[PDB]
Amino acid sequence: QFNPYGDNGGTILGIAGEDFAVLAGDTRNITDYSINSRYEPKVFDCGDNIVMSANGFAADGDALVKRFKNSVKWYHFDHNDKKLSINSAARNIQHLLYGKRF
Amino acid sequence: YSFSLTTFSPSGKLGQIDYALTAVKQGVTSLGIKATNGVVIATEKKSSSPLAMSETLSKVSLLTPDIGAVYSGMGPDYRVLVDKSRKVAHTSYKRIYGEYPPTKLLVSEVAKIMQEATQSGGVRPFGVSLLIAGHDEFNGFSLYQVDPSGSYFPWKATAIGKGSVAAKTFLEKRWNDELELEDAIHIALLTLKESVEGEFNGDTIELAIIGDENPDLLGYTGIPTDKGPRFRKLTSQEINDRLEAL
Amino acid sequence: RALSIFSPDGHIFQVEYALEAVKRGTCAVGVKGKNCVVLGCERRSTLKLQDTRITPSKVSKIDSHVVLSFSGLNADSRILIEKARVEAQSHRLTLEDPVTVEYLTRYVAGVQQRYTQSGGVRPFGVSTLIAGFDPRDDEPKLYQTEPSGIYSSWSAQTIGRNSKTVREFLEKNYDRKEPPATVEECVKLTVRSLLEVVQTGAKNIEITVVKPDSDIVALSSEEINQYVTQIEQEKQEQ
Amino acid sequence: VSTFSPEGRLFQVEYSLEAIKLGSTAIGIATKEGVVLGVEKRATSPLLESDSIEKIVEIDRHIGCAMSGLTADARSMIEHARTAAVTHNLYYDEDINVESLTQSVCDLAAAAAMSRPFGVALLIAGHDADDGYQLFHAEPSGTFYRYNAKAIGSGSEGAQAELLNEWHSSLTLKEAELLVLKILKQVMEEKLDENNAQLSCITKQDGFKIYDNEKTAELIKELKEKEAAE
Amino acid sequence: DRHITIFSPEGRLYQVEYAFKATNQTNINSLAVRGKDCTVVISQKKVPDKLLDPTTVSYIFCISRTIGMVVNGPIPDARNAALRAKAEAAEFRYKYGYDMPCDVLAKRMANLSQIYTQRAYMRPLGVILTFVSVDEELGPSIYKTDPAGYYVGYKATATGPKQQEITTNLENHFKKSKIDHINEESWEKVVEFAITHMIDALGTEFSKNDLEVGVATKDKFFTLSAENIEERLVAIAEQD
Amino acid sequence: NYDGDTVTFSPTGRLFQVEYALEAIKQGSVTVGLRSNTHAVLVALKRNADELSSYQKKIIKCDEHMGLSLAGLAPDARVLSNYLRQQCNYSSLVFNRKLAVERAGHLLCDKAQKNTQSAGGRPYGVGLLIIGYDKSGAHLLEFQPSGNVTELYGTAIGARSQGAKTYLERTLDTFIKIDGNPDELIKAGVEAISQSLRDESLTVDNLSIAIVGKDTPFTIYDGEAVAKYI
Amino acid sequence: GYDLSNSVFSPDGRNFQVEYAVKAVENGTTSIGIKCNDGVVFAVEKLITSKLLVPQKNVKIQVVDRHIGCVYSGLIPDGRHLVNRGREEAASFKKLYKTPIPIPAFADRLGQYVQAHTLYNSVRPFGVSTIFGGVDKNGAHLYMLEPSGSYWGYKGAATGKGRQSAKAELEKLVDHHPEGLSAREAVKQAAKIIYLAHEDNKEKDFELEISWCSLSETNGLHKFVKGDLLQEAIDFAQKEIN
Amino acid sequence: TIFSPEGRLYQVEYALESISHAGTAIGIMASDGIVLAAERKVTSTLLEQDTSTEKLYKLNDKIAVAVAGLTADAEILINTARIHAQNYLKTYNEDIPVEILVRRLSDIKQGYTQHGGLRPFGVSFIYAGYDDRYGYQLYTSNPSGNYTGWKAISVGANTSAAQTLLQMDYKDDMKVDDAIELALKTLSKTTDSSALTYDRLEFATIRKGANDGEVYQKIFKPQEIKDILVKTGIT
Amino acid sequence: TQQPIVTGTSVISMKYDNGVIIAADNLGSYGSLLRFNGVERLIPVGDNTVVGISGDISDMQHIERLLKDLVTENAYDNPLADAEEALEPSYIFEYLATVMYQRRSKMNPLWNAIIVAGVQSNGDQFLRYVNLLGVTYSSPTLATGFGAHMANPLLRKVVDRESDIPKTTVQVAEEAIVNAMRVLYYRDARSSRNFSLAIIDKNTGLTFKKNLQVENMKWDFAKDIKGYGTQKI
Ligand SMILES: [Mg+2]
Ligand SMILES: [Mg+2]
Ligand SMILES: [Mg+2]
Ligand SMILES: [Mg+2]
């Protein structure tokens, strides 16, 4: 049967300091016991002073990240270049993820 | 054009229907005469040039093995109506009860078609009037006439189109409730002759009857419940044979 | 096809004309007392040999505590009523509380409004007087809706032919300080008003009274007649 | 209904605007201490209960709007406006911007997939952090403009003119209250009392508040006095 | 009453009538006749502008392996009918297991026109269609349909501005001969007869680039080429 | 008789409705566009209905590398820009490619056309000047509701546009060479917008400027920031 | 009243709205095509309304697939529409049959589409005439299509305002060279004919545009005439123009 | 489906006119039955009246209706009528109350009034029906979609004439045999032709015979009309 | 929701200081039967891109059709079709990736593994992978199927990290790729001896070698092997 999902390993870690935050991630991308790439970033700058990482199945990680970055673009459109606050960004993602609850 | 084209006029008339009735009025005459053991419906094969071939225009049609129809008005509108009539005969009936519908029912269905034309958005009434003759186990023989309004009513004999009045008149005098088929044929022929302008013979006339069952026209022997169709169209020869006895 | 459209003067003819049909319809009125509301109406008399027993009455129950009467095309009303009744149950079912007269009104109003800006549909030839009492409340409610979709409440109001005339009667015979504080007098007042147009008639008038907590009752031809008589008396005694 | 005139204007839209001129005067004035919205009731009889006239509505805690024209048409518009502010709060966990809200409303306007334009205009007033207190006028055309003060409805011609005179970039909430009251008075056929005019304002601290007759009367009175000065 | 196919107070369909006039817009005349075992349809070919590619001018179409159709009417409407005639002919085969018969195809086409006659949104098509073929059951055949939805079969027929003159000519021949077909074994001669009798009625001589001939025999319909026609034209310049 | 819809050609082969639409443009404020070989500016004179409103925004960003100035029926401009935003977006997402200005133009044309050939529709009544920098340099496009799009070194559209159009028609040899310096290009852009003035001088609320080029993403300069250009 | 709605037949059986569309066509730029010995050339007159126009940019000829060239006169936008559909109609042919669409085929496709717009009053005919063609499995083909959906094959064809002048010139070519005409020749010739035809619009300076599809000069594909080859013909025209 | 400046529905008004030109149908509600009578439009010596059904139709075993207007428009409305009847029966297992069926049929007509753009139905109906809740009832529905119930009523040609004759001879305690007579009389005096003859009549009753319990619908056969005629003395 | 039928194996590739090389055999296998021997699996797109595909062939043939149309459609109303606005390898990739991810999200995947190798207009080498799941990654070397297990280890010996790319000549890279292809013929049962190689260099442009064969095979030693344990002869 076709399995639409996969696992590309990787590990990320976000830590928030008193007046800064970090989002760290390893760079390896793998499939089973093979290394697909020693260098394939997974933590990205989405604009608006927001960093995000979607770790797990790379395709889905990719899509999600794209949809969000894009979501930022339109937010600026439909709301006269208003900066997207992290919490707003957050609630947005909830919706993105949940849109695919099935 | 999703609105009714046929609307009510202040006098209370349905414009398009009356006009369609006018178109009918100009069509070639057709008649139906109901006998005791049969019914005949005839018309004239108005050849629009001797180059055209007479046979290739069935003005009289078999709707079911026991029901025929003839018209007056716009042939095309008739042709498509016969198609739909034969169809519904099956869909709304033979496919549900395994037998063909009874005349009044089919007639009723046809009517329904024409009425829709009278009310559905974006269309014009059919410019035809049909005389539908047939038979069925329970109602016996019947003849009906159907109008563009959708209105239908039964007759003992009638005629439509061009010489309707004159014809109806002649029919009114010769018809009686003890007529054997041959005789009504006779009368049909006689009535036909007066409305026919030129040559009156087996190639300009079209008679069809609904009578006894014809096993010879079935196509197979074996099953004895169905003994054959009742609708039979007359041959050029058969018509003339009778004409010669004028 | 857009039927209800604007004109060079800023009017939606179909809606405006809709009102005319309202005027052609018989009269209906309702005045609200201190702990009740009554609604009276005059009966149509184009042809007489009617079987009163069955004929669709003019005042209808939307729910056990809300009624509606109207003036206009009798057919157009039925629809408004059904849609209202069905919405009455739906509110119950999903909010676990029956509609408030206001809500019901706003529902009925919006329906009409909708027909004024929808293609292929002509506005409703109707105006309604909706009345009743909110669940677990006693303050009487009387509301009015028109084909435009506009609605509001009234201490007393009327619609239908000659509504202007009787409206006037009310404009001076109803004081917002002593609303007809008794079923009897509210009825009186409504009758009085109704008489000014009805033209001396028993079966000509039908009067319905609505009290708190689903207490609704239509007066019989004769209970009314008694009021008529006592009114012609407080007229003849002068 | 989508036909252009030789002058290049949409008929039904122009006509739609005329119907609006037939409606109760609505006025809003935008300051740095808030935005006031006041309207004229206009009861078609004194039997009618003046309080059942809704012409100033709350769209959301930080946005209210006054209407003028065929008011029933405005129902769907308010509904949509509300739903949108809410929905925006749901998806972003924040307050929608007045402009966005407005734009959202207008976005609905031109959808001539409803037989005719709306025969009503709105004065949407609100506040958001990025653009402060704002006043907007929304037309059935689908167009909308931001103003510092604006009047619409039957008496809008004179009113606008008077606004033009009274407004300066520094009035106080009270001042504007009065003006709306004033100008309301100047253009109302009936005499301005607390049962036929309605004031409301929206402030950062307390949000959209519709004034209770009593408070209004106190201002009406406070007005009669300040006016009968010279 | 005169813009859409509704009825006029006299019970007429004006738009249908005007569509019949447009059939003459082209000014072409054509005729068809049946042989002993074939069918021919001649149609005048008129190429005006010199800049035209003569080869692309035709009003005669190959509908299917067995059916040929000639049109009298404007080209747009004509090609529209062709495509559909083609499509329908194919579908018929796929679904029924044998080639659509010319008459059936004519009937089907007629029924389609009737619809334009009855529904207001559809304008009739201003064209007339003569379908010819040698049917496996019926033999040489000619069926013609018009904007009214009318259709019928002919011993021979003609269509165009000078329709009446051509017809009379033919009417006379068959009245003299007594039969309903040219009594010739090869199509070549029938084609000849056909063109002869066309010249006989129009009062004009034809060159090779002025005709258009289509022939239909058992299992095939083909249009002759200029040279082919010439061989005909030559042979006729011996009887006359 | 022949101006009821766009589905009717007149006897001289014209589409009045389209034409009438084009006239909708002429009643909008002037907006100018001009480009060099490294930048594209959009100077749009904004318009005011009263002295208490906003000077309607004429400039809309469609992507980080493209934008447009509108003159006419705002709603339509919104619809058209939005469609433009989407198509720009589609190119980015699906091909990671910036949409070519010429390509965008081809799109607007095609979009407008559909509204000039079908019953019930109405041509768009707004003109647009689209500027954008891409793989092939700076670009300026003029869009007309008839569906016609043209690539120009400069232009302007709206009420009295013909003034600036001649200025540019002569100043070409001068601005086509303002490479490496945006300030000048804008100055020219303003100088052009001024040859179509009459009402008064361009003010700080009047002006609206948009620039885009080599190392400069589509940016909207409104109010304050244009001060140095009057 | 028979000229207010599209599908309406007048008492003489003409569809007036179509004929009006034709007028929109006439009121436009001139364009032509010359079917040559193993290809076809297209050329059209781009009227330069102002110095403000960026030179050689607002291309008007269009390609369909890779081997068909299209040029039309009238309401430009209507042309584009006709071409987009052409493209969809061509793709659809390839996807299912593999071989790129034959010109006769393609033309008919465009034909049937336009003819369709003269069948319902809810649509207006196309305000343009298109000349197009190319090379296929068996020869070059040149066609012209009018708003009625009528189209035919040509030896040469032209349309727009300079139409008669142009046709005249083409007529000359046909009678003087029945053998054929090398692609190169036809190029210059078209350049000329356009220059000549430009006289019926002799008031504005123009920009010529030519394209060709030749089995020996462009491998059967549609390419635009630019550079050395374009200048050559521009001068060849400027020569015989006096 | 539009409004006049006066506040009337053109097509509806006009429809009613069409109707007034239709034969007359009468429904008289007695104390022990209901009568429906109708004079047939356009006839002849040749029309077969024996096997005819053009104005009196059975809707359900307990409800019958008389038609005045376009026969075809009628049949459409009828068929759906017959259907709503059966749907109710299936859903509840009780025969449909007359008013319910009538109100439903009305609602359709009204639809044509309010939206769609289709011409209304050129028909008016008289419903004679029985039910366990209100016993015998007589109803009438016209094109506007409006309906009402009567003790006696008529539709079609010469309403005012007949209506006035009924209002005169009708009395609360009538009996079928008397209503039949009255019906005939009224038709007899409001005809537009020579004299009432069996061949021009359609007659039917809904009685609840005392020697049983279920209502019996009897559509009179030609001979019976000829008979009921002699007795009443129309000869 | 399908199951591949005719299939193609590994596609190997790597990037060097001035371009990229990619190679793939010419086999179409029907399970274990090496059915088709003349199957080109490198699809050049323009003069700057080669798309190597493994997996199901019918799906590859479709991707072919799709790529051609991409070219055709890019020409449309594009006067710069063969210059500034020509298809870049990156555009082609993204299109492909997107398609793959959509087909999988609709559970009807393009059963393939594709490597898009090319050079961008500004000179940058481009090497990126995408499979039936829409998974994508880039690296100095890339290989699908067995190539991933066998070829990458070898190729990575030449280019282990980014910094090694500018130190690698075409001679080297090409040699590597060829050796790898030889290894796979030895160890991959579905490989074929004949292959195809393509180099996309920022100067020489696109070089596409067809009909290469694995040569220099070590097999002689097979003679000194008898039995599987104790058999002496
Ligand atoms: Mg926020
Ligand atoms: Mg010509
Ligand atoms: Mg039609
Ligand atoms: Mg039509």
Terminal Cα distance for chain F, rounded: 48
* Residues contacting residue E44 through CB under 8 Å, at least 6 positions apart: E28, E29, E30, E160, E206, E210, E211, E212
Distance CA E16, CA H149 (A): 50
Torsion of CA C59, C62, C63, C68, to 10 degrees: -40
Q: How far is the CA of E15 from the centre of ligand 3 (A)?
A: 8
Q: Do C157 and D116 touch (CB under 8 A)?
A: no
Q: What are the structure tokens assigned to D78, written together?
A: 């308010």
The verdict on a CB contact (< 8 Å) between G122 and F118 is yes
DSSP 8-class letter at C154: B
For residue I5, the enclosing domain spans: 1-233
Contact of A99 with chain I, judged by CB distance below 8 Å, is answered with no
Single-letter residue type at F133:
Y
**Cβ distance C125 to H3 under 8 Å?**
yes
The CA dihedral of C224, C225, C226, C227, to the nearest 10 degrees, is 60
Which other chains touch chain F, taking contact as 3+ CB pairs less than 8 Å apart?
Answer: A, D, G, I
Task: Sort F102 into a burial class: Cβ within 10 Å, 0-12 / 13-18 / 19+.
Answer: buried
Considering only CB atoms, G153 lies closest to which of E3, E21, E56, namely E56
For tokens 């599987």, the residue is I228
Domain D1-230, architecture per CATH: 4-Layer Sandwich (3.60)
Sheet holding F31-35, edge to edge: F154-157, F31-35, F39-44, F208-213, F216-222
- CB count, 10 Å around CB of A11? 11
| Structure-token pair, residue E105 | 């195809």
Angstroms from C189 CA to nearest CA on chain H = 30
Please name the member of F1, F147, F151 whose beta carbon is closest to the beta carbon of G57. F151
For residue C193, which phi and psi values (nearest 5 degrees)? -55, -55
**How many structural domains comprise chain E?**
1
Q: Which of F91, F93, F208, F222 to mutate to test the interface with A (most CBs of A within 10 A)?
A: F93
Pairing of the two strands F59-63 and F39-44: unpaired
- Cα dist. F132→F107, F129, F151, F152, H45 in Å? 15, 10, 11, 12, 89
Question: Is C150 exposed, middle or buried (CB count within 10 Å of its CB: 0-12, 13-18, 19+)?
Answer: middle
Task: State how many domains chain I has.
Answer: 1
Asked if F touches H (at least 3 Cβ pairs < 8 angstroms), the answer reads no
CB contact under 8 A, F52 and D147: yes
Phi, psi of F64 (to 5 degrees): -60, -15
Contact yes or no for F128/F120 (Cβ under 8 A): no
Tell me, in angstroms, the distance from the centre of ligand 3 to residue G122's CA. 13
Domains contained in chain F, number: 1
Residue D116: what are its φ and ψ, rounded to 5°? -150, 160
Q: Is C73 on the interface with H (CB under 8 A)?
A: yes
What residue segments make up the domains of chain B, in order of their start?
1-246
The bound ligand whose nearest atom lies closest to the alpha carbon of E14 is 3
Rounded-to-integer distance, Cα I143 and Cα I139, Å: 10
> Concatenated DSSP letters for G140-203?
EEEEEE-TTS-EEEBSEEEESTTHHHHHHHHHHHHHH-SS---HHHHHHHHHHHHHHHGGGGTT
Q: What is the Cα–Cα distance from E66 to E134, expressed in whole angstroms?
A: 7
Q: C237: part of which helix (H) or strand (E)? A: none
Cα F220–chain centre separation: 14
Torsion-angle region of F96 (φ positive above 0: left; ψ -120 to 50: alpha; else: beta): left
Q: Mind spelling out the 3-state secondary structure of chain B?
A: CCCECCCEECCCEEHHHHHHHHHHHHCCCEEEEECCCCEEEEEECCCCCCCECCCCCCCCEEEECCEEEEEEECHHHHHHHHHHHHHHHHHHHHHHHCCCCCHHHHHHHHHHHHHHHHHCECECCCCEEEEEEEEECCCEEEEEEECCCCCEEEECEEEECCCHHHHHHHHHHHCCCCCCHHHHHHHHHHHHHHHCCCCCCCCCEEEEEECCCCHHHCCCCCCCCCCCCCEEECCHHHHHHHHCCC
DSSP state of D123: E
- CA-closest candidate to residue B132, choices B78, B88, B93: B78
- Backbone phi, psi, residue E44, to 5°: -75, 150
Q: Which domain holds residue E162?
A: 1-240
Task: Report how far residue C81's alpha carbon sits from residue A63's, in angstroms, rounded to the nearest whole number.
Answer: 52
The number of residues making up chain E comes to: 240
- Ligand 2 centre from G9 Cα, in Å? 21
Give the C-alpha separation, H97 to H99, whole Å. 6
Q: How many angstroms separate the CA atoms of D121 and D115, rounded?
A: 17
Report the 10 Å Cβ neighbour count for E20: 18
CATH number of B1-246: 3.60.20.10
Q: How does D40-55 read in b/e, with b if 16+ C-beta sit within 10 Å?
A: bbbeeeebbbbebbbb
Dihedral sign from CA coordinates of G25, G30, G35, G38: negative
Rounded to whole angstroms, the Cα distance separating G135 from G155 reads 14
**Which residue in chain E is spatially nearest to G33 when comparing CA positions?**
E51
Range of the domain at F70: 1-230
Q: Residue C197, exposed/middle/buried by CB under 10 A (0-12, 13-18, 19+)?
A: buried
Cα angle F194-F195-F197, degrees, rounded to a multiple of 5: 65
Compute CA distances B18 → B9, G39, G102, whole Å.
11, 62, 53
Give CA–CA dist C69/H102, Å, rounded: 21
- Token duo for residue H83: 């259907």
Distance CA I160, CA I175 (A): 16
Element (H, E) at H18: helix H10-20
> Who's near E152: CB < 8 A, 6+ residues apart?
B48, B52, B53, B56, B57, E143, E144
* Token duo for residue C26: 């018989």
* B152/B167 Cα distance (integer angstroms): 19
Asked if residue D206 lies in contact with residue D58, where contact means CB atoms within 8 angstroms, the answer is no
Q: Cα–Cα–Cα angle for G168, G172, G174, nearest 5°?
A: 115
CA C189/CA C181 separation, integer angstroms: 11
CA G88 / ligand 2 centre spacing (Å): 29
Q: What is the 3-state secondary structure (H, E, C) of chain E?
A: CCCCCCCCCCCCCHHHHHHHHHCCCCCCCEEEEECCCCEEEEEECCCCCCCECHHHCCCEEECCCCCEEEEECCHHHHHHHHHHHHHHHHHHHHHHCCCCCHHHHHHHHHHHHHHHHHECCCCCCCCEEEEEEEECCCEEEEEEECCCCCEEEECEEEECCCHHHHHHHHHHHHHHHCCCCCCCCCHHHHHHHHHHHHHHHHCCCCCHHHEEEEEEECCEEEECCHHHHHHHHHHHCCCC
Tokens 């898009």 correspond to I116
- Own/partner contacts of I206-212, CB < 8 Å, gap of 24 or more, are I206/I44, I206/I47, I206/I48, I206/I50, I208/I42, I208/I44, I208/I50, I210/I40, I212/I178
Residues 6+ apart with CB under 8 A from D190: D42, D196
Closest CA to B175 of B166, B184, B185, B186: B184
- In angstroms, this model's resolution equals 2.4
CA separation, residue H213 to residues H41, H132, H174 (Å): 36, 11, 21
Domain span at H103? 1-235
Exposure on the CB side of residue E166, measured as CA atoms within 13 A:
26
Distance CA E219, CA E37 (A): 11
Is there an interface between H and B (3+ Cβ pairs < 8 A)? yes
Q: Which H/E stretch holds residue F75?
A: helix F74-95
Topology annotation, domain C1-238: Glutamine Phosphoribosylpyrophosphate, subunit 1, domain 1 (3.60.20)
Q: Is I73 helix (H, G, I), strand (E, B) or coil?
A: helix
Q: Do F135 and I94 touch (CB under 8 A)?
A: no
C-alpha–C-alpha distance, residues I127 and H203, integer Å: 93
| Domains and their CATH numbers in chain G | 1-242 (3.60.20.10)
Contact G1 E3 (CB under 8 A): yes
Query: Which are the catalytic amino acids of G?
Result: 29
β-strands C215-218, D26-30: how paired? unpaired
Q: Are I61 and I40 in contact (CB under 8 A)?
A: no
Query: Domain locations in chain C?
Result: 1-238
- Which residues of chain F make contact with D100, given a CB cutoff of 8 A? none
